[PDB]
Amino acid sequence: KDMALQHAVDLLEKMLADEEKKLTEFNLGDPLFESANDDPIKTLEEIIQEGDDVVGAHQLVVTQIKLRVQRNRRLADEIIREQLTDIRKVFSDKFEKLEQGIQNSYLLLDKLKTPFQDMRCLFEVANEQFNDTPVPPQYKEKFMVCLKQIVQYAVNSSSKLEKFVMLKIKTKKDDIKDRVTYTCMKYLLMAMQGTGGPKAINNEEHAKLFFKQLSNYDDLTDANHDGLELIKKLDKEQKEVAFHVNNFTHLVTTLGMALYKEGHQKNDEAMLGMHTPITMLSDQVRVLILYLIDEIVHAIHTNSNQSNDELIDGLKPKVRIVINEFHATLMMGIDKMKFYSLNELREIVNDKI
Amino acid sequence: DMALQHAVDLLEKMLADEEKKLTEFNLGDPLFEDDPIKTLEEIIQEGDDVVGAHQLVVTQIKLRVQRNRRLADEIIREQLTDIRKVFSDKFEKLEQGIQNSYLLLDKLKTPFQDMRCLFEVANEQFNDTPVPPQYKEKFMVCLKQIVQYAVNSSSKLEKFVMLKIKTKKDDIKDRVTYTCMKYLLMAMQGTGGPKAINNEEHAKLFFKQLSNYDDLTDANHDGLELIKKLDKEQKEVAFHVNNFTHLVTTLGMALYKEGHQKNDEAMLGMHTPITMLSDQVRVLILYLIDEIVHAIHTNNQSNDELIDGLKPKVRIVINEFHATLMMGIDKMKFYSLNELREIVNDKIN
């Protein structure tokens, strides 16, 4: 589909669905039937007030433990299920925010190409340098005529510089989308890896052992005593549940937070990454105009015999060479910011010729 | 000993080297001496003397080009300190981040030193396990012992856990120190300025063609244009300072956010393993309780017989934890008491 992070969103769905399925499965040791006993849970007070005799107390204590083990396991199961619900909530919200932010980064990145559209900046920089270049008056018109034509030739020959900018921009767009997607998937795995709460619950095991040794109690006042103490503990906070709730909440929150940042992070990686190439090419454009201007005035001075056409013509290969040189340099993607001097351009041109 | 010590070194190294190549901003004392640079206003009042004004014009151009060069360097000189201030601050903050994390990883392993936690869980589960008072003694005797065995039989498990926290401490210093350098370069690889200067190129052309001006007033006029532009340049130094400040700040934040994000990812990587290991310890204990009670409540055996019987089951379980822990988090799990039985049964045969 058309979401930048569509793969992340798909994987979130699949994992939750699979996990939600594993919750209802039957695993070894599970009873054939879970107990859903109707009768209401009575408070410790009520049990104390109703247990006149040691045998009536026992009846009351056993059943009230069983009702409570039932209640506690249900709430524990609910909490296991809410882990998945919480993962859906936190990661859906983070993906939506991340997606809205990737879309903005796309725009931002595309704004970087406008000066280079049809390499229109050559015209604008030529306009400026033409106004600021001093030229003895008797040379101005020829300077003008020849500069116009060779700048226009330069525009027509610099298609690869514009196509480079567009390639780089597209690369950063795809970088952002791939990197954020990978991070999204990574955090999602780490989240699903933390699910599953506790399985064994202390007080439930204690009840299981209690009910095992019910026959081995010589004195029913003793059996009642342990039973009542087990009731108190079954109404207290389940420590292992508390431990795992706080741990899982720390895990998902932190994953959540580490991800909210992520899009602004890859956004900035992209904009920072465009800094050197755009800056180098902007400088190259300027330096090209300056080199063309010096060549032209030097030719005008030193070779008044040849026509405008023959002057312009001798410059065309020099134009092609510099543009080629600029392009190879930018393609190298060094990220070491390199600028050219005119003297550097002349040596490169004087070599190829 | 600072964990990010190499980052800091490389910071002072690079700044220093870059600073060497800069030219001094203030001119020394002239052999023959007052400010040599004269205002636009002053140069204008010279203009009745065309030859006089011409000579003053070419001189003031050449002085302004050298002035503007010195400014260019004064720009970088103000930059390298912005790099220093930003990146010192972030290196310090990141370093504090690492030292904190060092303490948190130490915290994580403390329960497992000498596997002390096995005693603590045993205490709590003991106190809470219901048992007839005429068997309470048999329960206590058999539990204290077999838990002590479990502690003694877990030394290879323990040493592995410590090693994994040790390895993770080393991995944090290395990842964050990478992030620090990668971003130091960008602040460096992206400092300086262009080689070809517009006004300098214009000036060079002017002088190239000065002899072809038939009429000095044309030359004088062009020269004054050049001087105005050279002065506009000198007045744009702040703009390039600010722009590079914005740039370094952004590099600094992305530096901080990445070092931090890397730090937190390594800690979270330990979190769930540690959460499962602590649960596995608790389930082991509950499993030992259950065994003992089953073997006491039903089946004419002694404590030694019972306890002897439990030792192979213990080591099987601890080995199971150890083995899954080595395979990694994908092979690690929370256990039911009956999955321990399952495992213990499966291995014996």
XYZ file of C-alpha atoms in Angstrom:
702
model
C 0.000 0.000 0.000
C 0.957 3.680 -0.136
C 2.137 4.342 3.450
C 5.863 5.029 3.580
C 5.973 2.747 6.647
C 3.491 0.237 5.214
C 5.811 -2.716 5.951
C 6.035 -1.744 9.642
C 2.263 -1.420 9.958
C 1.802 -4.778 8.223
C 4.266 -6.536 10.507
C 2.548 -5.034 13.582
C -0.716 -6.533 12.451
C 0.708 -9.967 11.728
C 2.569 -10.319 15.017
C -0.357 -9.219 17.144
C -2.707 -11.558 15.298
C -0.359 -14.521 15.750
C 0.178 -13.645 19.397
C -3.542 -13.156 20.061
C -3.964 -16.670 18.675
C -1.362 -18.162 21.000
C -3.263 -16.875 24.027
C -6.286 -19.141 23.539
C -4.251 -22.248 22.755
C -4.136 -25.152 25.181
C -0.795 -25.880 26.803
C 0.295 -28.807 28.974
C -0.929 -28.873 32.562
C -3.973 -26.739 31.802
C -7.111 -28.313 33.312
C -9.730 -29.660 30.906
C -12.157 -27.073 32.286
C -11.335 -23.745 33.941
C -13.488 -23.155 37.017
C -16.188 -20.533 36.599
C -17.923 -20.871 39.970
C -20.865 -18.493 40.454
C -20.802 -17.855 44.231
C -19.636 -14.416 45.456
C -16.262 -13.745 47.072
C -16.625 -12.824 50.764
C -14.271 -10.454 52.588
C -11.995 -11.698 55.353
C -14.348 -10.070 57.870
C -17.404 -11.911 56.547
C -15.572 -15.231 56.599
C -14.426 -14.565 60.168
C -17.948 -13.592 61.292
C -19.586 -16.626 59.645
C -17.180 -19.319 60.808
C -18.746 -20.186 64.167
C -17.619 -23.795 64.072
C -14.303 -25.251 62.971
C -16.006 -27.366 60.274
C -18.229 -24.619 58.883
C -15.164 -22.402 58.785
C -13.280 -25.021 56.795
C -16.049 -25.319 54.207
C -16.032 -21.553 53.853
C -12.230 -21.219 53.684
C -11.616 -23.865 50.989
C -14.275 -22.572 48.603
C -13.257 -18.921 49.161
C -9.649 -19.765 48.270
C -10.797 -21.458 45.056
C -13.011 -18.510 44.093
C -10.032 -16.200 44.707
C -7.472 -18.244 42.750
C -10.057 -18.032 39.947
C -10.491 -14.254 40.268
C -6.696 -13.700 40.381
C -5.909 -15.874 37.397
C -8.624 -14.097 35.374
C -7.139 -10.706 36.154
C -3.684 -12.077 35.292
C -4.970 -13.366 31.948
C -6.592 -10.000 31.268
C -3.219 -8.342 31.887
C -1.476 -10.731 29.470
C -3.998 -9.705 26.796
C -3.538 -5.992 27.530
C 0.149 -6.319 26.739
C -0.901 -6.881 23.131
C -3.509 -4.143 23.271
C -0.859 -1.753 24.674
C 1.607 -2.696 21.953
C -1.018 -1.946 19.286
C -1.792 1.433 20.878
C 1.787 2.569 21.406
C 3.241 1.381 18.081
C 0.241 2.463 15.942
C 0.443 5.943 17.394
C 4.210 6.102 16.930
C 3.997 4.819 13.313
C 1.336 7.401 12.459
C 3.445 10.218 13.862
C 6.583 8.861 12.176
C 4.703 8.605 8.855
C 3.401 12.187 9.038
C 6.956 13.266 9.727
C 8.460 11.260 6.881
C 6.015 12.934 4.490
C 7.266 16.358 5.642
C 10.850 15.316 5.171
C 10.007 14.284 1.603
C 8.732 17.802 0.923
C 11.722 19.453 2.574
C 14.069 17.303 0.548
C 12.268 18.176 -2.705
C 12.610 21.928 -2.046
C 16.344 21.440 -2.429
C 16.045 20.889 -6.187
C 14.291 24.088 -7.244
C 17.444 26.190 -7.906
C 18.687 23.389 -10.135
C 15.521 22.975 -12.170
C 16.569 23.130 -15.837
C 19.813 24.370 -14.215
C 18.195 27.818 -14.064
C 20.721 28.938 -11.460
C 23.385 29.229 -14.224
C 21.363 32.036 -15.819
C 20.912 33.802 -12.437
C 24.554 33.504 -11.393
C 25.643 34.576 -14.903
C 23.344 37.585 -14.611
C 24.989 38.619 -11.350
C 28.625 38.022 -12.353
C 28.035 39.790 -15.656
C 26.918 42.917 -13.732
C 29.803 42.813 -11.297
C 32.589 42.030 -13.775
C 34.423 45.217 -14.814
C 35.308 45.284 -18.529
C 36.944 48.088 -20.520
C 33.997 49.752 -22.314
C 35.204 48.867 -25.850
C 34.897 45.197 -24.875
C 31.501 45.134 -23.115
C 29.222 44.187 -26.023
C 31.378 41.314 -27.274
C 31.781 40.145 -23.663
C 27.984 40.195 -23.343
C 27.329 38.420 -26.664
C 29.883 35.667 -26.043
C 29.001 35.108 -22.337
C 25.324 34.727 -23.174
C 25.966 32.046 -25.715
C 28.433 29.989 -23.731
C 26.323 30.123 -20.555
C 23.379 28.871 -22.622
C 25.613 26.122 -24.001
C 26.636 25.378 -20.366
C 23.001 25.031 -19.248
C 22.292 22.662 -22.168
C 25.317 20.542 -21.309
C 24.793 20.367 -17.531
C 21.833 18.015 -17.498
C 23.828 15.488 -15.491
C 24.342 17.981 -12.658
C 20.568 18.493 -12.290
C 19.950 14.744 -12.584
C 22.538 14.235 -9.841
C 20.675 16.488 -7.410
C 17.486 14.612 -8.151
C 19.222 11.257 -7.612
C 20.641 12.322 -4.259
C 17.310 13.723 -3.090
C 15.610 10.459 -4.036
C 18.310 8.534 -2.199
C 17.678 10.478 1.037
C 13.940 9.936 0.621
C 14.565 6.186 0.384
C 17.158 6.270 3.178
C 14.644 7.810 5.544
C 11.942 5.331 4.609
C 14.205 2.266 4.856
C 15.982 3.302 8.053
C 12.841 4.320 9.937
C 11.164 1.093 8.744
C 14.031 -1.047 9.973
C 13.962 0.704 13.384
C 10.186 0.271 13.532
C 10.529 -3.456 12.895
C 13.390 -3.829 15.340
C 11.528 -2.202 18.223
C 8.432 -4.192 17.403
C 10.344 -7.469 17.760
C 11.875 -6.411 21.081
C 8.366 -5.551 22.280
C 6.832 -8.883 21.293
C 9.858 -10.585 22.847
C 8.886 -9.099 26.215
C 5.318 -10.326 26.234
C 4.014 -13.242 28.254
C 3.982 -11.840 31.807
C 4.524 -14.554 34.391
C 3.138 -18.042 33.832
C 3.486 -19.481 37.316
C 1.795 -17.471 40.088
C 3.026 -17.901 43.685
C -0.250 -17.814 45.619
C -1.932 -20.067 43.065
C 0.805 -22.646 43.546
C 0.462 -22.252 47.293
C -3.277 -22.974 47.012
C -2.471 -26.011 44.832
C -0.060 -27.330 47.484
C -2.545 -26.434 50.243
C -5.324 -28.422 48.610
C -2.910 -31.320 48.106
C -2.035 -31.690 51.768
C -5.564 -31.146 53.079
C -5.743 -34.773 54.261
C -2.369 -34.538 56.071
C -3.761 -31.959 58.522
C -4.466 -33.701 61.851
C -6.009 -30.546 63.333
C -8.634 -28.684 61.301
C -7.853 -25.548 63.318
C -4.401 -25.704 61.699
C -5.734 -26.347 58.215
C -8.174 -23.477 58.726
C -5.318 -21.250 59.883
C -3.131 -21.814 56.795
C -6.245 -21.460 54.614
C -7.089 -18.084 56.111
C -3.478 -16.904 55.757
C -3.603 -17.966 52.121
C -6.751 -15.846 51.798
C -4.984 -12.730 53.069
C -2.151 -13.244 50.615
C -4.564 -13.914 47.707
C -6.097 -10.443 48.309
C -2.739 -8.678 48.478
C -0.891 -7.453 45.421
C 0.508 -10.342 43.426
C 4.227 -9.531 43.553
C 5.216 -11.408 40.399
C 2.385 -9.719 38.469
C 3.490 -6.320 39.800
C 7.120 -7.061 38.888
C 6.188 -7.997 35.313
C 3.704 -5.152 34.794
C 6.305 -2.563 35.737
C 8.931 -4.302 33.593
C 6.727 -4.634 30.538
C 5.499 -1.038 30.947
C 9.094 0.177 31.154
C 9.924 -1.839 28.033
C 7.060 -0.623 25.796
C 7.268 2.976 26.998
C 10.993 3.179 26.381
C 10.645 1.521 22.963
C 7.810 3.963 22.328
C 9.940 6.974 23.271
C 12.996 5.743 21.371
C 10.787 5.692 18.288
C 8.952 9.031 18.646
C 12.356 10.663 18.332
C 13.384 8.494 15.390
C 11.658 10.328 12.522
C 12.955 13.743 13.516
C 16.299 11.885 13.782
C 16.320 10.450 10.245
C 14.818 13.706 8.965
C 17.889 15.507 10.274
C 20.261 12.792 9.024
C 18.798 13.430 5.549
C 18.939 17.243 5.635
C 22.449 17.122 7.120
C 23.445 14.624 4.412
C 22.328 16.932 1.581
C 24.435 19.768 2.969
C 27.791 18.926 1.347
C 26.551 17.886 -2.151
C 24.187 20.849 -2.523
C 26.839 23.238 -1.193
C 29.541 21.850 -3.487
C 27.378 22.045 -6.568
C 26.219 25.565 -5.759
C 29.798 26.631 -5.463
C 30.784 24.798 -8.704
C 28.102 26.633 -10.635
C 29.442 29.966 -9.437
C 33.064 28.986 -10.123
C 32.142 27.839 -13.614
C 30.682 31.257 -14.447
C 33.827 32.974 -13.129
C 36.118 30.749 -15.188
C 34.024 31.332 -18.344
C 34.145 35.085 -17.748
C 37.951 35.124 -17.413
C 38.364 32.914 -20.497
C 36.113 35.144 -22.553
C 37.692 38.450 -21.588
C 41.148 36.895 -22.071
C 40.177 35.721 -25.585
C 38.608 39.072 -26.439
C 41.784 40.838 -25.397
C 44.288 38.437 -26.943
C 42.483 37.389 -30.138
C 40.414 40.255 -31.611
C 40.728 38.705 -35.113
C 38.517 35.616 -34.640
C 34.737 35.927 -34.705
C 32.377 35.593 -31.737
C 31.478 32.149 -33.094
C 35.096 30.995 -33.132
C 35.625 32.309 -29.560
C 32.434 30.644 -28.267
C 33.342 27.440 -30.169
C 36.793 27.150 -28.562
C 35.154 27.323 -25.122
C 32.585 24.591 -25.648
C 34.996 21.715 -25.045
C 36.380 23.507 -21.938
C 32.787 23.788 -20.672
C 32.247 20.064 -21.257
C 35.452 19.161 -19.420
C 34.645 21.225 -16.307
C 31.094 19.900 -16.108
C 32.451 16.352 -16.468
C 35.030 17.030 -13.736
C 32.412 18.552 -11.414
C 30.139 15.577 -12.010
C 32.750 12.897 -11.352
C 33.711 14.701 -8.136
C 30.109 14.876 -6.862
C 29.458 11.245 -7.793
C 32.280 10.219 -5.471
C 30.096 11.371 -2.533
C 33.159 11.828 -0.273
C 31.350 14.132 2.220
C 34.664 15.974 2.462
C 33.575 19.421 1.264
C 35.732 20.295 -1.765
C 35.817 23.649 -3.576
C 37.597 24.536 -6.855
C 39.843 27.482 -7.659
C 40.009 28.884 -11.184
C 43.681 27.852 -11.327
C 42.489 24.311 -10.585
C 39.938 24.444 -13.430
C 42.540 25.723 -15.921
C 44.974 22.944 -15.102
C 42.235 20.331 -15.516
C 41.233 21.908 -18.865
C 44.796 22.421 -20.130
C 45.455 18.730 -19.460
C 42.481 17.245 -21.363
C 43.541 19.438 -24.294
C 39.688 7.817 33.137
C 37.087 9.229 30.730
C 35.263 6.678 28.514
C 34.973 9.142 25.613
C 38.678 10.095 25.926
C 39.588 9.406 22.267
C 36.715 11.559 21.041
C 37.973 14.442 23.170
C 41.576 13.956 21.970
C 40.564 13.925 18.310
C 38.518 17.063 19.022
C 41.495 19.013 20.315
C 43.736 17.517 17.613
C 41.569 18.473 14.639
C 40.737 21.970 15.924
C 44.399 22.654 16.546
C 45.536 21.512 13.063
C 42.835 23.563 11.352
C 43.909 26.557 13.445
C 47.543 26.253 12.327
C 46.706 26.977 8.679
C 44.859 30.201 9.539
C 46.549 33.552 9.024
C 46.859 36.037 11.888
C 44.047 38.600 11.909
C 46.064 41.633 13.073
C 48.779 43.104 10.822
C 52.216 43.548 12.365
C 54.010 46.885 12.424
C 54.917 48.239 8.944
C 58.557 48.936 8.078
C 57.417 52.372 6.930
C 54.259 53.608 8.683
C 46.910 55.546 11.041
C 44.630 53.005 9.322
C 45.858 52.221 5.774
C 42.314 51.424 4.652
C 40.379 54.571 3.783
C 36.585 54.875 3.722
C 34.504 55.027 0.564
C 33.784 58.643 1.588
C 37.469 59.587 1.720
C 38.309 57.934 -1.624
C 35.507 59.903 -3.206
C 36.947 63.284 -2.079
C 40.117 62.342 -3.970
C 38.265 62.222 -7.294
C 39.031 65.703 -8.655
C 42.568 64.425 -9.132
C 41.795 61.638 -11.649
C 45.322 60.165 -11.617
C 45.467 60.750 -7.839
C 42.134 58.999 -7.330
C 43.182 56.189 -9.652
C 46.314 55.411 -7.694
C 44.319 55.547 -4.429
C 41.675 53.265 -5.968
C 43.961 50.423 -7.012
C 45.725 50.522 -3.667
C 42.476 50.456 -1.668
C 41.218 47.522 -3.734
C 44.286 45.466 -3.047
C 44.153 46.299 0.669
C 40.476 45.419 0.855
C 41.054 42.040 -0.786
C 43.711 41.270 1.808
C 41.398 42.563 4.582
C 38.524 40.387 3.403
C 40.886 37.386 3.309
C 41.828 37.945 6.932
C 38.106 38.147 7.743
C 37.477 34.804 6.021
C 40.007 33.313 8.426
C 38.524 35.183 11.378
C 35.285 33.487 10.345
C 36.820 30.005 10.654
C 38.562 31.097 13.855
C 35.132 31.857 15.333
C 33.798 28.598 13.908
C 36.374 26.220 15.371
C 35.434 27.550 18.805
C 31.725 27.002 18.150
C 32.660 23.443 17.219
C 34.667 23.245 20.414
C 31.908 24.648 22.630
C 29.114 22.540 21.133
C 31.089 19.304 20.959
C 32.710 19.627 24.413
C 29.270 20.087 25.944
C 27.778 17.101 24.121
C 30.803 14.866 24.792
C 30.544 15.657 28.503
C 26.783 14.977 28.587
C 27.229 11.783 26.560
C 30.040 10.656 28.885
C 27.747 11.136 31.888
C 25.223 9.051 29.977
C 27.749 6.221 29.753
C 28.876 6.378 33.390
C 25.197 6.235 34.493
C 24.620 3.220 32.257
C 27.681 1.569 33.727
C 26.048 1.776 37.185
C 22.705 0.489 35.836
C 24.352 -2.566 34.265
C 26.176 -3.259 37.523
C 22.790 -2.990 39.289
C 21.346 -5.633 36.952
C 24.000 -8.248 37.725
C 24.039 -7.778 41.506
C 21.156 -10.247 42.169
C 23.155 -12.959 40.402
C 26.504 -12.500 42.165
C 26.925 -15.774 44.037
C 23.302 -16.290 42.910
C 22.219 -14.632 46.162
C 18.714 -14.083 44.731
C 18.137 -17.848 44.949
C 18.289 -17.510 48.754
C 16.003 -14.514 48.835
C 13.311 -16.092 46.670
C 13.633 -19.346 48.648
C 13.013 -17.441 51.900
C 9.868 -15.743 50.558
C 8.358 -18.807 48.900
C 9.146 -20.860 51.994
C 7.411 -18.453 54.366
C 4.351 -18.439 52.120
C 4.049 -22.144 51.295
C 1.324 -23.873 53.387
C 2.354 -27.140 55.004
C 1.069 -29.265 57.898
C 3.075 -28.413 61.065
C 4.071 -32.083 61.471
C 5.780 -31.877 58.060
C 7.075 -28.272 58.325
C 10.402 -29.571 59.587
C 10.836 -32.045 56.691
C 9.922 -29.276 54.250
C 12.433 -26.799 55.707
C 15.257 -29.348 55.889
C 14.797 -30.581 52.308
C 14.286 -27.074 50.849
C 17.260 -25.357 52.529
C 19.546 -28.101 51.257
C 18.374 -28.525 47.671
C 18.314 -24.733 47.193
C 21.921 -24.658 48.430
C 22.733 -27.325 45.833
C 21.015 -25.230 43.153
C 23.179 -22.271 44.167
C 26.351 -24.394 44.044
C 25.321 -25.925 40.711
C 24.760 -22.613 38.935
C 28.308 -21.202 38.819
C 28.660 -21.536 35.039
C 25.275 -19.829 34.644
C 26.396 -17.004 36.927
C 29.767 -16.363 35.247
C 28.047 -16.201 31.858
C 25.588 -13.542 33.027
C 28.421 -11.381 34.371
C 30.298 -11.796 31.093
C 27.240 -10.653 29.114
C 26.924 -7.517 31.263
C 30.682 -6.968 30.929
C 30.506 -7.343 27.136
C 27.564 -4.946 27.048
C 29.494 -2.323 29.011
C 32.299 -2.493 26.445
C 29.799 -2.335 23.569
C 28.315 0.888 24.896
C 31.639 2.755 25.057
C 32.412 1.654 21.515
C 29.099 2.546 19.894
C 28.851 5.994 21.510
C 32.471 6.812 20.746
C 31.797 5.983 17.095
C 28.815 8.350 17.068
C 31.025 11.061 18.570
C 33.691 10.823 15.864
C 31.419 10.460 12.827
C 29.774 13.731 13.886
C 33.041 15.452 14.779
C 34.247 14.929 11.172
C 31.033 16.353 9.661
C 31.550 19.504 11.699
C 35.151 19.481 10.349
C 34.858 18.070 6.785
C 32.222 20.773 6.466
C 34.201 23.789 7.649
C 36.110 26.478 5.786
C 35.028 28.294 2.649
C 35.342 28.421 -1.153
C 38.717 28.875 -2.891
C 37.438 31.169 -5.657
C 36.323 34.502 -4.216
C 34.033 36.671 -6.370
C 35.496 40.066 -5.485
C 38.995 38.641 -5.682
C 38.236 37.302 -9.117
C 36.739 40.610 -10.195
C 39.799 42.438 -8.866
C 42.163 40.102 -10.684
C 40.300 40.703 -13.910
C 40.292 44.489 -13.348
C 44.064 44.486 -12.975
C 44.437 42.174 -15.962
C 42.636 44.716 -18.123
C 43.739 48.002 -16.486
C 46.040 48.885 -19.373
C 43.172 48.589 -21.851
C 41.158 51.347 -20.292
C 41.621 54.274 -22.717
C 40.073 56.624 -20.243
C 41.126 56.481 -16.572
C 37.742 57.720 -15.379
C 36.195 54.497 -16.689
C 38.803 52.532 -14.762
C 38.346 54.726 -11.696
C 34.608 54.245 -11.876
C 34.849 50.469 -12.152
C 37.356 50.438 -9.301
C 34.909 52.233 -7.009
C 32.207 49.687 -7.887
C 34.643 46.994 -6.891
C 35.310 48.792 -3.576
C 31.608 49.049 -2.750
C 31.209 45.309 -3.389
C 34.311 44.495 -1.334
C 32.740 46.500 1.507
C 29.380 44.755 1.174
C 31.339 41.531 1.608
C 33.045 42.704 4.791
C 29.588 43.487 6.146
C 28.305 39.933 5.567
C 30.629 38.231 8.017
C 27.897 37.830 10.664
C 25.548 36.044 8.219
C 28.141 33.307 7.562
C 28.963 33.032 11.266
C 25.313 32.485 12.226
C 24.664 30.007 9.409
C 27.564 27.849 10.556
C 26.367 28.177 14.177
C 22.979 26.810 13.130
C 24.838 24.037 11.324
C 27.017 23.043 14.294
C 24.067 23.106 16.725
C 22.099 20.743 14.491
C 25.129 18.444 14.252
C 25.371 18.613 18.053
C 21.760 17.621 18.682
C 21.869 14.750 16.181
C 25.108 13.792 17.944
C 23.388 13.795 21.313
C 20.266 12.052 20.069
C 22.237 9.303 18.393
C 24.645 8.653 21.290
C 21.701 8.572 23.681
C 19.546 6.329 21.413
C 22.471 3.895 21.098
C 22.959 3.894 24.869
C 19.283 3.148 25.600
C 19.105 0.381 22.927
C 21.905 -1.572 24.615
C 20.211 -1.300 28.000
C 16.839 -2.426 26.675
C 18.667 -5.315 25.071
C 19.554 -6.538 28.580
C 16.200 -5.706 30.173
C 14.042 -8.555 28.910
C 16.778 -11.203 29.245
C 17.204 -10.109 32.875
C 13.440 -10.081 33.399
C 13.228 -13.653 32.145
C 16.239 -14.866 34.161
C 14.716 -13.468 37.383
C 11.422 -15.167 36.586
C 13.186 -18.392 35.752
C 14.853 -18.277 39.193
C 11.477 -17.805 40.875
C 9.894 -20.656 38.932
C 12.790 -22.985 39.727
C 12.091 -22.377 43.448
C 8.349 -22.988 43.102
C 9.179 -26.161 41.161
C 11.491 -27.304 43.988
C 8.775 -26.597 46.569
C 6.279 -28.613 44.514
C 8.594 -31.631 44.081
C 9.371 -31.782 47.800
C 5.716 -31.519 48.799
C 4.674 -34.177 46.279
C 7.397 -36.486 47.531
C 6.493 -35.837 51.176
C 2.677 -35.839 51.098
C 2.801 -39.158 49.209
C 5.766 -41.571 49.204
C 8.003 -43.750 52.947
C 11.340 -42.253 51.832
C 14.063 -40.357 53.729
C 15.220 -36.768 53.218
C 18.465 -37.974 51.642
C 16.663 -40.248 49.166
C 14.239 -37.400 48.302
C 17.049 -34.785 48.015
C 19.408 -37.097 46.095
C 16.560 -37.619 43.632
C 16.151 -33.851 43.127
C 19.779 -33.049 42.237
C 19.676 -34.346 38.638
C 16.388 -32.432 38.091
C 17.974 -29.224 39.454
C 20.982 -29.363 37.150
C 18.754 -30.169 34.153
C 16.697 -27.028 34.877
C 19.675 -24.751 35.489
C 21.360 -26.089 32.359
C 18.146 -25.435 30.475
C 18.244 -21.774 31.576
C 21.933 -21.558 30.757
C 21.475 -23.109 27.292
C 18.577 -20.884 26.252
C 20.351 -17.834 27.668
C 23.307 -18.568 25.371
C 21.096 -19.052 22.298
C 19.750 -15.561 22.999
C 16.414 -13.832 23.631
C 14.577 -15.490 20.732
C 15.101 -18.848 22.480
C 14.326 -17.557 25.983
C 10.945 -17.859 27.694
C 8.759 -17.549 30.804
C 7.957 -20.916 32.352
C 5.004 -22.695 33.930
C 5.824 -25.164 36.677
C 4.757 -27.962 34.356
C 7.064 -26.900 31.521
C 9.927 -27.478 33.959
C 8.584 -30.960 34.627
C 8.204 -31.477 30.860
C 11.877 -30.514 30.361
C 13.198 -32.420 33.373
C 11.359 -35.552 32.253
C 12.503 -35.272 28.617
C 16.221 -35.069 29.428
C 16.591 -37.971 31.887
C 15.580 -40.356 29.086
